[PDB]
Amino acid sequence: SLTFYPAWLTVSEGANATFTCSLSNWSEDLMLNWNRLSPSNQTEKQAAFSNGLSQPVQDARFQIIQLPNRHDFHMNILDTRRNDSGIYLCGAISLHPKAKIEESPGAELVVTERIL
């Protein structure tokens, strides 16, 4: 099972936004995904994490960071901008015994004006 918190988070443009994806099980070869619902309501991958490496699809601002306990990860958006505002969720792919995929509930990010 996967949880993704905060369910609702607000940060000012330019600041980083950090979500936490928590897994109920973890393995070295586990594959982590950070997704965002598109305007057309489709799940699009923002970044993936595997073998200790955060891999951006096209925007390096989306970092996936494994926390010390190893089963929790920070989905860190660097230098947020207004249009990062939207719905996100994380997913985990087990690349062991048999491929198993699961996704967490979605969470909302609201990026407001830059602090004056």
Side-chain angles (χ1 to χ4, degrees), residues 1-95 97-99 101-116:
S1 56
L2 301 182
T3 56
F4 197 49
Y5 296 131
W8 184 87
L9 171 64
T10 189
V11 296
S12 301
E13 178 162 69
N16 66 124
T18 308
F19 287 95
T20 297
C21 179
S22 296
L23 334 184
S24 63
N25 67 281
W26 176 80
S27 292
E28 310 66 54
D29 49 38
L30 196 55
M31 235 287 268
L32 263 296
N33 282 170
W34 185 357
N35 300 150
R36 178 184 179 179
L37 293 197
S38 73
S40 62
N41 300 310
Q42 299 310 303
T43 291
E44 311 188 317
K45 191 199 312 305
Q46 304 302 293
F49 181 96
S50 64
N51 301 308
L53 177 66
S54 184
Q55 302 153 57
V57 173
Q58 59 186 301
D59 194 326
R61 288 179 309 122
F62 296 80
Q63 316 188 97
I64 293 173
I65 303 161
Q66 177 172 46
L67 299 184
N69 63 31
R70 305 177 190 177
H71 56 268
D72 292 334
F73 299 72
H74 269 342
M75 320 315 256
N76 192 228
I77 295 183
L78 300 165
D79 190 26
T80 56
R81 52 174 181 266
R82 308 306 297 288
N83 66 21
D84 283 325
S85 297
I87 304 300
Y88 301 79
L89 67 156
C90 60
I93 300 171
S94 301
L95 298 170
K98 182 182 178 181
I101 323 172
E102 74 176 311
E103 304 196 306
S104 71
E108 186 182 351
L109 171 67
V110 180
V111 182
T112 55
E113 300 86 350
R114 283 174 171 283
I115 298 167
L116 296 176

